[PDB]
Design an enzyme around this catalytic site. Structure first.
Site, PDB file in Angstrom:
ATOM      1  N   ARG A  45     -13.565 -28.533  16.592  1.00 47.38           N
ATOM      2  CA  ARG A  45     -14.136 -29.668  17.006  1.00 47.38           C
ATOM      3  C   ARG A  45     -14.257 -30.964  17.219  1.00 47.38           C
ATOM      4  O   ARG A  45     -13.808 -31.674  17.600  1.00 47.38           O
ATOM      5  CB  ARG A  45     -15.308 -29.700  16.713  1.00 47.38           C
ATOM      6  N   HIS A  49     -12.974 -33.641  19.190  1.00 50.61           N
ATOM      7  CA  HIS A  49     -13.742 -35.457  19.586  1.00 50.61           C
ATOM      8  C   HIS A  49     -12.368 -36.225  19.690  1.00 50.61           C
ATOM      9  O   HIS A  49     -13.021 -37.649  19.533  1.00 50.61           O
ATOM     10  CB  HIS A  49     -14.361 -35.266  18.304  1.00 50.61           C
ATOM     11  N   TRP A 188     -23.083 -19.225  18.977  1.00 47.92           N
ATOM     12  CA  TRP A 188     -22.942 -18.167  20.182  1.00 47.92           C
ATOM     13  C   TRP A 188     -22.573 -17.401  20.458  1.00 47.92           C
ATOM     14  O   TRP A 188     -22.891 -15.972  21.654  1.00 47.92           O
ATOM     15  CB  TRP A 188     -21.940 -19.318  21.095  1.00 47.92           C
TER      16      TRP A 188
HETATM   17  C1  HEM Z   1     -20.639 -30.665  27.065  1.00 44.59           C
HETATM   18  C2  HEM Z   1     -19.240 -30.581  26.251  1.00 44.59           C
HETATM   19  C3  HEM Z   1     -19.776 -30.294  25.040  1.00 44.59           C
HETATM   20  C4  HEM Z   1     -20.962 -30.553  23.968  1.00 44.59           C
HETATM   21  C5  HEM Z   1     -22.468 -31.439  24.728  1.00 44.59           C
HETATM   22  C6  HEM Z   1     -20.702 -29.903  22.939  1.00 44.59           C
HETATM   23  C7  HEM Z   1     -22.402 -30.055  22.413  1.00 44.59           C
HETATM   24  C8  HEM Z   1     -21.758 -28.754  20.968  1.00 44.59           C
HETATM   25  C9  HEM Z   1     -22.697 -29.056  19.927  1.00 44.59           C
HETATM   26  C10 HEM Z   1     -24.700 -29.705  20.207  1.00 44.59           C
HETATM   27  C11 HEM Z   1     -21.962 -29.047  18.712  1.00 44.59           C
HETATM   28  C12 HEM Z   1     -22.722 -28.707  17.185  1.00 44.59           C
HETATM   29  C13 HEM Z   1     -22.500 -29.368  16.094  1.00 44.59           C
HETATM   30  C14 HEM Z   1     -23.817 -29.458  14.173  1.00 44.59           C
HETATM   31  O1  HEM Z   1     -25.170 -29.640  15.136  1.00 44.59           O
HETATM   32  O2  HEM Z   1     -22.861 -29.536  13.795  1.00 44.59           O
HETATM   33  C15 HEM Z   1     -21.479 -28.836  18.762  1.00 44.59           C
HETATM   34  C16 HEM Z   1     -20.131 -27.693  18.014  1.00 44.59           C
HETATM   35  C17 HEM Z   1     -18.365 -27.163  18.350  1.00 44.59           C
HETATM   36  N1  HEM Z   1     -17.773 -27.702  19.436  1.00 44.59           N
HETATM   37 FE1  HEM Z   1     -19.260 -28.541  21.234  1.00 44.59          FE
HETATM   38  N2  HEM Z   1     -19.498 -29.815  22.764  1.00 44.59           N
HETATM   39  C18 HEM Z   1     -19.613 -29.818  23.967  1.00 44.59           C
HETATM   40  C19 HEM Z   1     -18.053 -28.996  23.868  1.00 44.59           C
HETATM   41  C20 HEM Z   1     -16.265 -29.019  23.389  1.00 44.59           C
HETATM   42  C21 HEM Z   1     -15.580 -28.475  23.452  1.00 44.59           C
HETATM   43  C22 HEM Z   1     -14.678 -28.575  24.998  1.00 44.59           C
HETATM   44  C23 HEM Z   1     -15.163 -27.645  22.295  1.00 44.59           C
HETATM   45  C24 HEM Z   1     -13.999 -27.709  21.541  1.00 44.59           C
HETATM   46  C25 HEM Z   1     -12.647 -26.860  22.543  1.00 44.59           C
HETATM   47  C26 HEM Z   1     -16.113 -27.741  21.366  1.00 44.59           C
HETATM   48  C27 HEM Z   1     -16.116 -27.100  19.768  1.00 44.59           C
HETATM   49  C28 HEM Z   1     -17.542 -26.868  19.436  1.00 44.59           C
HETATM   50  C29 HEM Z   1     -17.462 -26.171  17.997  1.00 44.59           C
HETATM   51  C30 HEM Z   1     -15.998 -25.456  17.710  1.00 44.59           C
HETATM   52  C31 HEM Z   1     -18.362 -26.433  17.016  1.00 44.59           C
HETATM   53  C32 HEM Z   1     -19.488 -25.857  16.190  1.00 44.59           C
HETATM   54  C33 HEM Z   1     -18.153 -26.836  15.394  1.00 44.59           C
HETATM   55  C34 HEM Z   1     -18.818 -26.128  13.341  1.00 44.59           C
HETATM   56  O3  HEM Z   1     -19.762 -24.770  13.760  1.00 44.59           O
HETATM   57  O4  HEM Z   1     -18.586 -27.076  12.921  1.00 44.59           O
HETATM   58  N3  HEM Z   1     -16.961 -27.994  21.963  1.00 44.59           N
HETATM   59  N4  HEM Z   1     -20.917 -28.753  20.423  1.00 44.59           N
END
Ligand code: HEM
Length: 291
Positions: A45, A49, A188
């Site tokens: 992430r 980012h 998820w």
């Molecule tokens: C429209 C695109 C996306 C949005 C709205 C978004 C939104 C979110 C949000 C709401 C979370 C929760 C973070 C937190 O509460 O700790 C998050 C987690 C995460 N996202 Fe994104 N994201 C998106 C796309 C991406 C993409 C493109 C990837 C990376 C290749 C991704 C990878 C991750 C991963 C791995 C986490 C989990 C982190 C953890 O569990 O600590 N995200 N995302």
């Protein structure tokens, strides 16, 4: 705005595999974090980012300069939770002070995916640190309470197409949301620290109910215990998106290949690679190494 890649002086593949290994090893030893989820998902992430701030129109943002190290980038509100990944990597930078911030944050991402059994992501060194005045403004990352048109449109600024968007969003179904972080809560899929195509599957095969969470945000909830962001859920509402979702749900390998390309593209956006620059590296895992 040109950003030419510049290999860290005299280093080479061996140098970077060393750095890989260190990251892989600490990912192994620091396993209790986030309810035994591990640091994997937060590392990817964080790599997304720091690349997701790129603006194709002016070549601003992107992983080139490593300005997430600046309080402005670092304290962008939508980066919440990422500090844990920053702290993880800090001791490694100390141990390999010669590597640049951007290389370390992107390799951090590459290392995670491969170590969580995802596909191999080729990688290229050469990112060079740039002054705090290059630090981009809060606001270039996407919102979660939007629709497919939002998603499609947002990603156009990153030069990502429908097939690319859908592959990236999958994110191997890694980790989860944390209410304290984003106002969302839950994972998820069942295997939150193994890279899979489970996100498509779940998306298509679960029974989702639009509910409101304790942060008073709506989200899609399943009986299984999974969730989906509105933006996640919109992937099956769009007819173009939907088609690709069914493709990845029905083909493990296609997904793995597509993701590997888009992830790399995402990490290399805005960087100019000289012709005499080395070809990308493909690092072996600990597993492949016997470590
Ligand atoms: C429209 C695109 C996306 C949005 C709205 C978004 C939104 C979110 C949000 C709401 C979370 C929760 C973070 C937190 O509460 O700790 C998050 C987690 C995460 N996202 Fe994104 N994201 C998106 C796309 C991406 C993409 C493109 C990837 C990376 C290749 C991704 C990878 C991750 C991963 C791995 C986490 C989990 C982190 C953890 O569990 O600590 N995200 N995302």
């Amino acid at each position: 705005l040109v950003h030419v890649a510049s290999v860290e002086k005299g280093r080479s593949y061996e140098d970077f595999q060393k750095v890989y290994n260190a990251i892989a090893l600490k990912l192994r030893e620091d396993d209790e974090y986030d309810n035994y989820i591990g640091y994997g998902p937060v590392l990817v992430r964080l790599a997304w980012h720091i690349s997701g701030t790129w603006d194709k129109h002016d070549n601003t943002g992107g992983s080139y300069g490593g300005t997430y190290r600046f309080k402005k980038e670092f304290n962008d509100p939508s980066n919440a939770g990422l500090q844990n990944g920053f702290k993880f990597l800090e001791p490694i930078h100390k141990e390999f002070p010669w590597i640049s911030s951007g290389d370390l944050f992107s390799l951090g991402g590459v290392t995670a995916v491969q170590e969580m059994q995802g596909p191999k992501i080729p990688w290229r060194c050469g990112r060079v640190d740039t002054p705090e005045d290059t630090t981009p403004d809060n606001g270039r990352l996407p919102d979660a309470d939007k629709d497919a048109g939002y998603v499609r449109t947002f990603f156009q600024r990153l030069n990502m197409n429908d097939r690319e968007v859908v592959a990236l969003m999958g994110a191997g179904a890694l980790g989860k949301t944390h209410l304290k972080n984003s106002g969302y809560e839950g994972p998820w899929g069942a295997a939150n620290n193994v890279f899979t195509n489970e996100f498509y599957l779940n998306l298509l095969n679960e029974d989702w109910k639009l509910e409101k969470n304790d942060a008073n945000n709506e989200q899609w909830d399943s009986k299984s215990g999974y969730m989906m962001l509105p933006t996640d859920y919109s992937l099956i509402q769009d007819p173009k998106y939907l088609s690709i979702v069914k493709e990845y749900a029905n083909d493990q390998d296609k997904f793995f290949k597509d993701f590997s390309k888009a992830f790399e593209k995402l990490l290399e956006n805005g960087i100019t690679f000289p012709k005499d620059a080395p070809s990308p590296f493909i690092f072996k895992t600990l597993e492949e190494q016997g470590l």
